[PDB]
């Protein structure tokens, strides 16, 4: 039990404080799931609604983990980064393939001339 917690607080729960709690639980609620929880229950949540928001945040962490794990399969350069070249190869070869230009535009809009942090890339995409 929290040794330093007061006495007050209720009549709902601010979603900023709910995002704070999820983040301490080892999650990372984005603006998207923070938006759809507003566009459903409002600026403050009941305990049941807080649980659903946490569940939502569990799914998004699992999704991000899968993406980071995916890009790491092509990490020949020990660990951390991938080149724009490797990146466009993935994005133009598989799925709803982006065109050569679409792959360039997106990677050029992201950052460095030849080196991309794929962990931050996935964070942003989700």
């Amino acid at each position: 039990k929290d040794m330093f917690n007061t006495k007050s607080s209720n009549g709902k729960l601010r979603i900023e404080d709910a995002s704070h709690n999820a983040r301490k639980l080892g999650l990372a609620p984005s603006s998207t799931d923070e938006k759809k929880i507003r566009d459903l229950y409002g600026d403050s949540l009941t305990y049941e609604q807080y649980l659903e928001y946490l569940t939502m945040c569990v799914h998004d962490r699992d999704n991000m983990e899968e993406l980071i794990k995916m890009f790491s399969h092509f990490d020949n350069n020990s660990s951390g980064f991938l080149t724009k070249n490797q990146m466009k190869n993935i994005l133009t070869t598989w799925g709803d393939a982006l065109t050569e230009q679409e792959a360039n535009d997106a990677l050029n809009a992201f950052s460095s001339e030849d080196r991309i942090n794929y962990k931050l890339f996935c964070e942003d995409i989700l």
């Binding site: 999704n63 899968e66 993406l67 995916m70 993935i90 994005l91 598989w94 799925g95 709803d96 393939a97 982006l98 679409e102 997106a106 809009a109 996935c122 995409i125 989700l126």
Partner: peptide, 13 residues
Amino acid sequence: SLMRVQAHIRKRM
């Protein structure tokens, strides 16, 4: 999946 990544990239026009 990669399908998700591509769809989000496209949503950024």
